[PDB]
Amino acid sequence: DKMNESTRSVLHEVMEQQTLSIAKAGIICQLNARTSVLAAANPIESQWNPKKTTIENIQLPHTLLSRFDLIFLLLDPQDEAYDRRLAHHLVALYYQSEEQAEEELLDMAVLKDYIAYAHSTIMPRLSEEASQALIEAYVDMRKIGSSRGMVSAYPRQLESLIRLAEAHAKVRLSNKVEAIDVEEAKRLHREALKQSATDPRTGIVDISILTTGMSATSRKR
Amino acid sequence: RLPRSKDAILLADLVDSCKPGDEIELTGIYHNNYDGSLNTANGFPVFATVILANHVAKKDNKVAVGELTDEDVKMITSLSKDQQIGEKIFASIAPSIYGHEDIKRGLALALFGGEPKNPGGKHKVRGDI
């Protein structure tokens, strides 16, 4: 959250263009950066503020937040059941022993090998049902905008769903992306928007990602 | 990109022909000599170079009073005889701009300028407009 403005601008350049231009000391070149950005952002104050949405709490621009495919909230519920389960899990972590360590390292090794192999050989491509499902998903999530005359989606959401569906097809080594992948992509994407783009007064609203200051805030003026 | 540069040597009357910041136009002999410091810096038999100057002009001072000829003075002083010289000079400022005759007039008066003075040798007043 607290990277300075120059870092914000160059990261915007990297995330949008997948390149980093430098004109520093007579060097003039455009370095490649096809990097997958994984981010961790804190609230500006010490605690999360449920009276405010993510962009107003963390004070990052929409020009960066709209480049992210998925945004997730990591705050914990205040439920005593959640606290008790978390405490039992942490006690189990304290009692972690050599057998659990070997099991975890076996899982880690096979996970690394699986990801590397999937990178090395799998290249998903669109099926006809995938194309129909993606078009249907974008049109359906745009049909929500019939209410209130609002915009409920934008085409980069569709491209995000394409990326997520291809990733899911690569997870199961299909090499052809189809409706099972597209529905999982829709589910996870909708859950991410539900977590991140929820105005407290009205729930999920897509304009929170497009611009700061949702309608319930902007209608003060 | 970073700009390249060369050293030049001015001798005799060519000194004070230019100052830092001057967009000069330099004629000279491109001369080279052995330099041990450059040799050790590059690790090769590299010879330093310098321009032995022979003429220094300036690309902004394309004309100067020290270069005006008698014919230039004669045709200038013939032009001043014309009663339309004020209008000719005003029309001659930025001729590719239509109108703005008051602007051209004011710019002509500033371009020519007033006379500086110091009455009593103790009280300066500017001549520039």
**Number of strand segments of chain A:** 4
Q: How many helices of chain A does DSSP assign?
A: 10
Number of strands of chain B: 3
Write down the overall geometry of chain A.
globular
Provide a count of the helices of chain B: 4
Going across the biggest sheet of chain A, name each strand in turn. Answer: 1-2
Q: Element order, helices and strands of chain A?
A: HEEHHHHHHHEEHH
Kindly state the percentage of residues in helix of chain B.
Answer: 25-40%
Protein name (chain B): DNA replication licensing factor MCM2
Modified residues (Phosphoserine) (chain B): 96
Subcellular location (chain B): Nucleus; Chromosome
Family (chain B): Belongs to the MCM family.
Defining traits:
part of a larger assembly; 2 chains; A: about 220 residues; mainly alpha; two-stranded antiparallel ribbon; 10 helices; 4 strands; about 55% helix; B: about 130 residues; alpha+beta; DNA replication licensing factor MCM2 (chain B); DNA replication licensing factor MCM4 (chain A)
Describe the structure.
The structure is cut from a larger assembly and holds chains A (about 220 residues) and B (about 130 residues). Chain A is mainly alpha-helical. Chain A contains 10 helices and 4 strands, in the order H-E-E-H-H-H-H-H-H-H-E-E-H-H. Chain A has helices at about 5-15, 55-60, 60-65, 80-95, 100-120, 130-145, 155-170, 180-195, 205-210, 215-220; strands at about 20, 30, 200, 205. In chain A, the strands form 2 sheets. Chain A has a two-stranded antiparallel ribbon. Chain A is globular. Chain B is α+β, with helices and mostly antiparallel strands and about 130 residues long. Chain B is about 30% helix and about 20% strand. Chain B has 4 helices and 3 strands. Chain B has helices spanning about 35-40, 70-80, 85-90, 100-110, and strands at about 10, 25-35, 45-60. In chain B, strands 1-3-2 form a 3-stranded mixed beta sheet. Chain B starts with 7 loop residues before the first strand and ends in a 17-residue tail after the last helix. The chains hardly touch.
